[PDB]
Write an enzyme that holds these catalytic residues in place. Sequence first.
Site, PDB file in Angstrom:
ATOM      1  N   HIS A  67       0.183  79.602  53.266  1.00  0.00           N
ATOM      2  CA  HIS A  67      -1.100  79.033  52.838  1.00  0.00           C
ATOM      3  C   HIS A  67      -2.191  78.918  53.927  1.00  0.00           C
ATOM      4  O   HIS A  67      -3.371  78.623  53.620  1.00  0.00           O
ATOM      5  CB  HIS A  67      -0.872  77.708  52.128  1.00  0.00           C
ATOM      6  CG  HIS A  67       0.009  76.766  52.867  1.00  0.00           C
ATOM      7  ND1 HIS A  67      -0.418  76.067  53.975  1.00  0.00           N
ATOM      8  CD2 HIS A  67       1.289  76.379  52.634  1.00  0.00           C
ATOM      9  CE1 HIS A  67       0.568  75.296  54.405  1.00  0.00           C
ATOM     10  NE2 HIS A  67       1.615  75.472  53.611  1.00  0.00           N
ATOM     11  N   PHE A  94      -6.264  77.427  60.491  1.00  0.00           N
ATOM     12  CA  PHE A  94      -7.531  78.073  60.056  1.00  0.00           C
ATOM     13  C   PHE A  94      -7.734  77.948  58.569  1.00  0.00           C
ATOM     14  O   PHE A  94      -6.799  78.131  57.772  1.00  0.00           O
ATOM     15  CB  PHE A  94      -7.602  79.540  60.471  1.00  0.00           C
ATOM     16  CG  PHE A  94      -7.730  79.714  61.940  1.00  0.00           C
ATOM     17  CD1 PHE A  94      -8.953  79.605  62.564  1.00  0.00           C
ATOM     18  CD2 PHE A  94      -6.587  79.851  62.742  1.00  0.00           C
ATOM     19  CE1 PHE A  94      -9.063  79.714  63.919  1.00  0.00           C
ATOM     20  CE2 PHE A  94      -6.701  79.939  64.115  1.00  0.00           C
ATOM     21  CZ  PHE A  94      -7.955  79.899  64.695  1.00  0.00           C
ATOM     22  N   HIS A  95      -8.941  77.557  58.181  1.00  0.00           N
ATOM     23  CA  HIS A  95      -9.250  77.356  56.773  1.00  0.00           C
ATOM     24  C   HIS A  95     -10.517  78.111  56.479  1.00  0.00           C
ATOM     25  O   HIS A  95     -11.496  78.003  57.279  1.00  0.00           O
ATOM     26  CB  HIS A  95      -9.453  75.841  56.503  1.00  0.00           C
ATOM     27  CG  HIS A  95      -8.196  75.062  56.487  1.00  0.00           C
ATOM     28  ND1 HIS A  95      -7.714  74.381  57.597  1.00  0.00           N
ATOM     29  CD2 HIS A  95      -7.344  74.784  55.470  1.00  0.00           C
ATOM     30  CE1 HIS A  95      -6.597  73.758  57.273  1.00  0.00           C
ATOM     31  NE2 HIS A  95      -6.344  73.990  55.993  1.00  0.00           N
ATOM     32  N   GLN A 112      -8.905  73.825  63.021  1.00  0.00           N
ATOM     33  CA  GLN A 112      -8.455  72.458  63.229  1.00  0.00           C
ATOM     34  C   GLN A 112      -7.359  72.399  64.325  1.00  0.00           C
ATOM     35  O   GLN A 112      -6.223  72.879  64.143  1.00  0.00           O
ATOM     36  CB  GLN A 112      -7.980  71.881  61.892  1.00  0.00           C
ATOM     37  CG  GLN A 112      -9.036  71.878  60.771  1.00  0.00           C
ATOM     38  CD  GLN A 112      -8.472  71.578  59.394  1.00  0.00           C
ATOM     39  OE1 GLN A 112      -7.270  71.676  59.151  1.00  0.00           O
ATOM     40  NE2 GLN A 112      -9.379  71.282  58.440  1.00  0.00           N
ATOM     41  N   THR A 181      -5.012  67.604  55.731  1.00  0.00           N
ATOM     42  CA  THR A 181      -5.706  68.162  54.589  1.00  0.00           C
ATOM     43  C   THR A 181      -4.798  69.018  53.679  1.00  0.00           C
ATOM     44  O   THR A 181      -5.260  69.594  52.682  1.00  0.00           O
ATOM     45  CB  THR A 181      -6.872  69.026  54.984  1.00  0.00           C
ATOM     46  OG1 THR A 181      -6.448  70.005  55.913  1.00  0.00           O
ATOM     47  CG2 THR A 181      -7.989  68.181  55.593  1.00  0.00           C
ATOM     48  N   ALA A 182      -3.501  69.026  53.989  1.00  0.00           N
ATOM     49  CA  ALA A 182      -2.499  69.623  53.122  1.00  0.00           C
ATOM     50  C   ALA A 182      -1.296  68.694  53.013  1.00  0.00           C
ATOM     51  O   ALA A 182      -1.106  67.814  53.881  1.00  0.00           O
ATOM     52  CB  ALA A 182      -2.047  70.973  53.718  1.00  0.00           C
TER      53      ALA A 182
END
EC number: 1.6.5.4
Length: 239
Positions: A67, A94-95, A112, A181-182
């Site tokens: 993911h 990385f997003h 992040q 954030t996950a």
Amino acid sequence: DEFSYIDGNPNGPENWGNLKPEWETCGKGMEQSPIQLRDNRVIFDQTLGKLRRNYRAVDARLRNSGHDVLVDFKGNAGSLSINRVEYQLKRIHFHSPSEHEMNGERFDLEAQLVHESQDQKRAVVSILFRFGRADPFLSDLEDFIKQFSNSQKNEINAGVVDPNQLQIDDSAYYRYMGSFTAPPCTEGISWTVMRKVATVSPRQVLLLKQAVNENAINNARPLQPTNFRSVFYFEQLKS
Ligand SMILES: O=C1O[C@H]([C@@H](O)CO)C(O)=C1O
């Protein structure tokens, strides 16, 4: 570890917190990240100072979690100092697109930097990017990132990775308390989000997106409610 970024799907972000007991804070916590960062709601704190980093080039692995793509450092990659507490740099996720917004704007990538104190407190430094000139940091990793796409593999030794190639302007940032954030969306995380927006090339983001599962091609968690928590802001004046 099945979770998805597809809104409306059974495993998607609105449902994370009902997927398994270990992920409940995702649904019930009240200091979740990411949030909207709004200049007109910030508390100024000149006392925070320029961001205090001492990072070191070190041996690293690149990992595809399915993911996201992250950098996982093997040696001691140096540290971040907040209130003279020291947090070691462990990983960079990385997003794309960004997860944080600034004044309503969503950016093209967010990196992040996850750090951990000896006390095991966590701090994340976030960098926001717009499409422009290539990021020097990702340039040195492109050919390794490609291999997730041209092969079967899900870890790669990236050799020595230098975090001082990161586009970090230490003179201005937001600061607030949040969460991963996950899943498991654990709280108690100090977030620093850098004011200065970096650049990354489209090619670099495409390489990243090529790497992950289909349900994670866009891997930003939707913005979570601020819930009245404070957001601090530091910015160094010319004087
Ligand atoms: O705060 C964080 O949450 C993300 C996670 O969403 C990665 O997929 C991560 O590792 C952080 O730095």
